[PDB]
């Protein structure tokens, strides 16, 4: 983390063991690419030098698989950034090494000069995680997901909602998918119960109506 | 959280990682809408700016399903509040944005001006969670719940008590349901044992009598 | 908790999140009424105002069932205390509200005037938990417990020891039950092995002899 | 714990909740008598007054069974110490009560006078745990342990190594048992694979050779 | 840990209980020799005297098996170091005891004189863990690993990637193994799906292509 000395001096202290425990526990239970890890890190990564955002990501337990896809995607995003900002004709500017904080000494990362670099680094990592989770089809194809046999509608809803959120499409498309799919991919037992309960509004029904009917009596 | 400087100045510090771990552990084991989460948050949300009450809720792991119902219910409650307090003719008053702390800068949230806003925000979230848990019928219909085959009476009692508590009805109704249902929805093995043990007081028996008889020899 | 300012002033700080995690983890793994929770709370409840002893108890995860029995038993004990100390003819004395710290403001609880109240409150809660665990027959009837088929003698010993401890009887009775039952309620496989190993001292054998024989070769 | 004030004054602070969590987690996962608990406590018991070493032991979750054997063994060791040091003819000396810190007030325990008592108390507890684990045959008889069917050689090695360590015999005996038993108590599938892989050195083979052969291709 | 007093004095404080919890949790879930433990320790072992690096390793829960192989390998590496640096003809130099910090008092370890010793000790332990994990074939032979029946390609990828990383061979060899094996050791269901999806690039395909095809629709 970056420490703001009273005189405005900036120094680096190791990520507090407690912060690793929270990030790691989210990483074991939910995916390293899971939106929950993406959020936790974004809440706690306002005070983290560029190197730490990268190190915490490497240290967090998770499959070598996802850590492999993220490393490739993170590099790919960095490539695009570099073609975008040719080296600076006047002034230091930002090079991929500076933004990824490779070649710079830990204390230097805290120095305010890199203020921009922490932000961009977090941006790529939080872009990388989003891209990896979508590719991992951990949510899966949105229409593809269907109710498990003898499964609570809420659980199907949880998978269906995650898939609808993961797809990179405008909100209106997500809304139509959320209302229409909830019934189409639903199991017959909830489907029939919803069909009678919500009548002919099954397509125009909200998630709340469908989840206060199949899950409940 | 809000920090009261000795000079009475108010500053914001991130929720301590430890506080997220306790809230998250309750959220994984018990529901994000579970009464236990509702209590923990209410014990630790006296010092939390309006934004944090909302952020901690979003970050806590839980189904996207419940996080979907809560977001809708929280908005619905905010709507009712706004129809109730038309904009202020004289003075700032409270707008939905101020109470939900959207559009305000983090440090500003701590400023005492928003004292009222933290309270209302916590009120809606703690109302929202209550409403979502009741809708989720996670306790289920109160009379509907019945003893599982080969299940300890205490476990049936735990489901029966939760359902009786969740229903939004006056305490006397809850008392009648607690005494009468405990025997009616009970399995025959406890039912017969209680019938002989408590004699003709099975309807007028307390939970203690029924739980010191079927669970015990 | 109660904070002793250097000038002897007493102020209240929220129970540290860490202390709730330890108490909660004991409560999920072992019973809220389990002796382990009874001990942890008694080690950490010397500095807790009366309100906190009551709040921590409500917040700790546990069945609504036990939380129901404890609430009734705690009230029952408070009743007995009140019939015992009729209101004070001269002086404030202690009323049920003061001891349960209901109607008093948080900061007031820390004030030394209530020193007696924290002690009594902890006394009732720690009496209540003991009574609830015994009623819950979570240890069960002491003679009733018997060795599970294909179960280590140590495990049977653990249930047998807990039941022998829970029964509210003089130590000599507990000693006789511990020595005699260990063999009588034991499974035939340990029983026969102990019968040959300890010879005719099976009744006068200690737990150590029986547990260094059936568990071991 | 004992706090060394700058003026050399000694005061007692409660064991930090975090220290109980680490000791408790080791106690649930590994035995209260497990060598791992024996080590953790010995690393953190240099600053603990005699009373705390005893209290932490009582509070740690574990079977009432082991807590029963340890209490007896701890008393037995204290007995031997007392027959060894008849009361002091001149000077306070150490009595069983002082070493076990029973009858002394908490703050008094921290006072340097008891410096010797903390050491002896920890000595008996760490002797007691060692004795209880050996008696519990949790490692079991060393030769008796054999490879489980369809079990990794490393797992058999882990049980075999623990049993070889638990037996109170000179290191050379442990070395012979470690080299010879590793093959004799091994399952035929590893046995045959090792017999071909290590040739006629199966008796003179180290653990490394045997574990780089059966576990690996 | 080593504490840098403002005057540059160096003092030792016990490893904070929190740091043991993070290292232990990684050790229970992942191997004590697992790369994740190797990393965590390397992030937190810049401020640890030589003795602590060794003690934390002994205290961390893990099989007595791996703790046996590591102890042997650590000694073996120390041997090589000693044949390499014959005792110092002029000056203290480093002896195996100084680097392993055996015979030196705790406070002395923090003294800057041993600065070199902490680094070397960490070097051997982090070399030892790497060697033990490779020997443990916990990743296993790289070509040997194959897709489990009805297993997600990502899981096979995770085992395949770990094995490819563990083998001590130049990166180009790892790249060829990663691209070629991913298809060869893959199960027929992913194999056939990949064969059609990636066409004739199955050998020249990256991990990303193969994991966006078999795992996803």
Swiss-Prot record, chains A, B, C, D, E:
Species, as recorded: Caprine arthritis encephalitis virus (strain Cork) (CAEV-Co)
Coiled coil: none
Designated name of the protein: Capsid protein p25
Full protein stretch here: 137 to 353 of 441
Cell compartment(s), UniProt: Virion
């Amino acid at each position: 983390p970056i420490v703001v000395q009273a005189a405005g001096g900036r120094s680096w202290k190791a990520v507090d063991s407690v912060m690793f425990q929270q990030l790691q526990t989210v990483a074991m239970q939910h995916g390293l690419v899971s939106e929950d890890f993406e959020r936790q890190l974004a809440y706690y990564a306002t005070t983290w030098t560029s190197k730490d955002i990268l190190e915490v990501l490497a240290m967090m337990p998770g499959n070598r698989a996802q850590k492999e896809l993220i490393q490739g995607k993170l590099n790919e995003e960095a490539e695009r950034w570099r073609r975008n900002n040719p080296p600076p004709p006047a002034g230091g500017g930002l090079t991929v090494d500076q933004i990824m904080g490779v070649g710079q000494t830990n204390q230097a990362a805290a120095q305010a000069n890199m203020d921009q670099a922490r932000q961009i680094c977090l941006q790529w990592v939080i872009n990388a995680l989003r891209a990896v989770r979508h590719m991992a089809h951990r949510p899966g194809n949105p229409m593809l997901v269907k109710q498990k046999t003898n499964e609570p509608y809420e659980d199907f809803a949880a998978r269906l909602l995650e898939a609808i959120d993961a797809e990179p499409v405008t909100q209106p498309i997500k809304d139509y998918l959320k209302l229409t799919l909830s019934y189409t991919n639903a199991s017959a037992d909830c489907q029939k119960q919803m069909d009678r309960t919500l009548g002919q509004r099954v397509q125009q029904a909200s998630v709340e109506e469908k989840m206060q009917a199949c899950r409940d009596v």
